[PDB]
Design a protein around this ligand. Structure first.
Ligand SMILES: [Mg+2]
Ligand SMILES: [Mg+2]
Ligand SMILES: [Mg+2]
Ligand SMILES: [Mg+2]
Ligand SMILES: [Mg+2]
Ligand SMILES: [Mg+2]
Ligand SMILES: [Mg+2]
Ligand SMILES: [Mg+2]
Ligand SMILES: [Zn+2]
Lengths: 134, 38, 176, 136, 94
RNA sequence: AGCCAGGAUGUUGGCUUAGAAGCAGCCAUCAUUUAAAGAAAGCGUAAUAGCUCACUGGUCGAGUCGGCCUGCGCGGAAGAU
RNA sequence: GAUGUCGGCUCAUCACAUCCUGGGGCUGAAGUAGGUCCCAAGGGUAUGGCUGUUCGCCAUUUAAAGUGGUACGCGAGCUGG
């Protein structure tokens, strides 16, 4: 069993996705044709990392995952790199709105009593990259 | 084991014991930690 | 202390005999004897045995916790058995029993043929499995230790004689 | 390595080291290192204990040294006979009496301070003890 | 809270004071007001444990000698040079 | 102190690298549902898997823990007819 | 009112802080061979070239060519460089 953070659009390039789960024993070209039946739906390049409940010899059926938060932050900042240590340099402080438009992402699949609480965890990665609120 | 005048617990799993008038350290996790006072 | 102050309960079918310090217990597995230290009053007062110190002996309670554990192992030992297993690891390692002898083959030029004591019995469901049975707890760890001593498990591959209890820590050889 | 900038005289009599100390209370910090024993503390010893202090604590708090090696010690070099004048100054010692606070520290918790002084104390030739500030 | 149960010193000075500290008592003195000074010997560990607290050297304290409850403040304290012991206390009345 | 159970949500936190996933190092070092969980203790993995403490509890029924003051002892302690 | 001093030779003897052999723990000990420490003084422990040499360098050996004490062991035993 070998895992790597696999592309949704590309299947069987040899370094990054060949070992990914086409070499686990999952059908990569029916994961990433069935998952790509699901990432024919998904936005242009969200690595939405599912949990694999799979078999060895060409059979499969997958459970699914919620799309990321870390990949979706850097859009309106105008940058595609990162700091060595945030809270000294920031990548342009962004709105609640985009941190709340990323809070649209992990809402449908949590168990809270009062749903306001999870706006804190979305900003355990915010200060940890520089995305502090006004 | 290592034999020295000063014998000490080097980890939690170490244990002091006196066996024939000799302070020793036994460790279940690291044989490097075995010590005899001497 | 807590060990001594918990009484030794004897179940049905174990005849006990207190001749002062010298004390023996009889069972289906067989007679077992002990000669306790002078600092231990041992008493029949029930269908149990009780352990406490004899005034005039500083050790005292220490011996009584010892004595308690011993008889408990004896009382258990005569009714039910003590059984230590030993698993052999090694491509060409194997064991066989001939009656009161275990003929071990452990990668030696000579053959290892270990002789058992009076009340220990060894079987082998597998070429690489020894299974002792005996009333005494001390003799069966002494025998299992001796058998373990011929080929004590080496760390790298875990090759040798191991107790099946034994968990062996494996290390990797010096790089390059 | 501490040493007087200037001294009135080059060489001092051997003297004696009797009595209890002055500078017996912690005066500048919260915690201190107090001598129990008696004996000379050389400048090299004081610097080594100080080096070990300031590293057990990393840029944390403040450290004071309450002793100063102001006494010059002499040695005749190897293969010189007795006499022919007093020897040459080789090192500087502070005379220590039982009770002398040797170093003081604040700005760190106690527990780090117990550990800092334990390492420093290993460098010194005198029994020591941890001590705390006292009110009135 | 601090109620020190004290006795009166029958002999004074160095020999007598050392004889006390060898017996887990230490000398002390009460002064102030216009009453004459009063030399007391205290039990060491009793006073030792109480002066560990902070409100021993700031609040009013009371010393009982011959039954009489004498109120005081702690004024000066002679500590041992290199031990957690006590040589002498000055108590001022208040 | 013995003896049963869990270690999760963002998430492979970010950087780097051929890959760094709690566990190379580096900065954020806060959340989260909750009875609980250090952005993770060393092991371990090429790296993840895995391993398990911290973590909070249940059943168990009398003392237990670890610092200070000291007393007497222990080690530290090898030499030549 | 004398205790002959370097090295060699002959003969040695003790100590062990052990060079080999023996027994062992840790190893960044796969094996072979090592490293380090612990126990052990029973026995064993070079020939030559150069130099008065001790020593040392070099050549070639050996399982190893141990370290020290004995008036830097030994000239009423030899030598006398
Ligand atoms: Mg006098
Ligand atoms: Mg030896
Ligand atoms: Mg013999
Ligand atoms: Mg030669
Ligand atoms: Mg010799
Ligand atoms: Mg000589
Ligand atoms: Mg002679
Ligand atoms: Mg000549
Ligand atoms: Zn250990």
């Amino acid at each position: 069993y070998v895992k790597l953070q696999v592309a949704a659009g590309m299947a069987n390039p040899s370094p990054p996705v060949g070992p990914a789960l086409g070499q686990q024993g999952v059908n990569i070209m029916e994961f990433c044709k069935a998952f790509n039946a699901k990432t024919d739906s998904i936005e242009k390049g969200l690595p939405i990392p599912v949990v694999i409940t799979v078999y060895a010899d060409r059979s499969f059926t997958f459970v699914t995952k919620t799309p990321p938060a870390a990949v979706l932050l850097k859009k309106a900042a105008g940058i595609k790199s990162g700091s060595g240590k945030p809270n000294k340099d920031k990548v342009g402080k962004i709105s609640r709105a985009q941190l709340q438009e990323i809070a649209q992402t992990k809402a449908a699949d949590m168990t809270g009593a009062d749903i306001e609480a999870m706006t804190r965890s979305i900003e355990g990665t915010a200060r940890s990259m520089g995305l502090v609120v006004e | 084991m290592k034999v020295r005048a000063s014998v000490k617990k080097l980890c939690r799993n170490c244990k002091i014991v006196k066996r024939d008038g000799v302070i020793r350290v036994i460790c279940s996790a690291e044989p490097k930690h075995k010590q005899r006072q001497g | 202390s807590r060990v001594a102050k918990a009484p030794v309960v004897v179940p049905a079918g174990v005849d006990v005999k207190i001749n002062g310090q010298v004390i023996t217990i009889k069972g289906k597995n067989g007679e077992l004897t002990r000669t306790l230290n002078d600092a231990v009053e041992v008493k029949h007062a029930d269908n149990t045995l009780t352990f406490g110190p004899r005034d005039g002996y500083a050790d005292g309670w220490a011996q009584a916790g010892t004595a308690r554990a011993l008889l408990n192992s004896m009382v258990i030992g005569v009714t039910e058995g003590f059984t230590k297993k030993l698993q052999l690891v090694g491509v060409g390692y194997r064991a066989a029993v001939k009656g009161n002898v275990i003929n071990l083959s452990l990668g030696f030029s000579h053959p290892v043929d270990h002789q058992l004591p009076a009340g220990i019995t060894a079987e082998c469901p597998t070429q690489t499995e020894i299974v002792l049975k005996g009333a005494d707890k001390q003799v069966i760890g002494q025998v299992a230790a001796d058998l373990r001593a011929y080929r004590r498990p080496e760390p790298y591959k875990g090759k040798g004689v191991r107790y099946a209890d034994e968990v062996v820590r494996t290390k990797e050889a010096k790089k390059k | 390595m501490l040493q007087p900038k200037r001294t009135k005289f080059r060489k001092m009599h051997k003297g004696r080291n009797r009595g209890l100390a002055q500078g017996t209370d912690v005066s500048f910090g919260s915690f201190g290192l107090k001598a129990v024993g008696r004996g000379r503390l050389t400048a090299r010893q004081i610097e080594a204990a100080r080096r070990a202090m300031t590293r057990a604590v990393k840029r944390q708090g403040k450290i004071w040294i309450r002793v100063f090696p102001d006494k010059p010690i002499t040695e005749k070099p190897l293969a010189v006979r007795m006499g022919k004048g007093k020897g040459n100054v080789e090192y500087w010692v502070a005379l220590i009496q039982p009770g002398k606070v040797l170093y003081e520290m604040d700005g760190v918790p106690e527990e780090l301070a117990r550990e800092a002084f334990k390492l420093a104390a290993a460098k010194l030739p005198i029994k020591t003890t941890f001590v705390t500030k006292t009110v009135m | 809270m601090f109620t020190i149960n004290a006795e009166v010193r029958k002999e004074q000075g160095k020999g007598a004071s050392r004889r006390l500290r060898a017996a887990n008592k230490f000398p002390a003195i009460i002064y102030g007001g216009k009453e004459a000074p009063l030399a007391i010997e205290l039990d060491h560990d009793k006073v030792m444990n109480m002066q560990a607290k902070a409100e021993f050297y700031s609040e009013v304290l009371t010393i009982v000698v011959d039954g009489k409850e004498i109120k005081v403040k702690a004024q000066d304290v002679q500590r041992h040079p290199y031990k957690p012991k006590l040589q002498h206390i000055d108590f001022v009345r208040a």
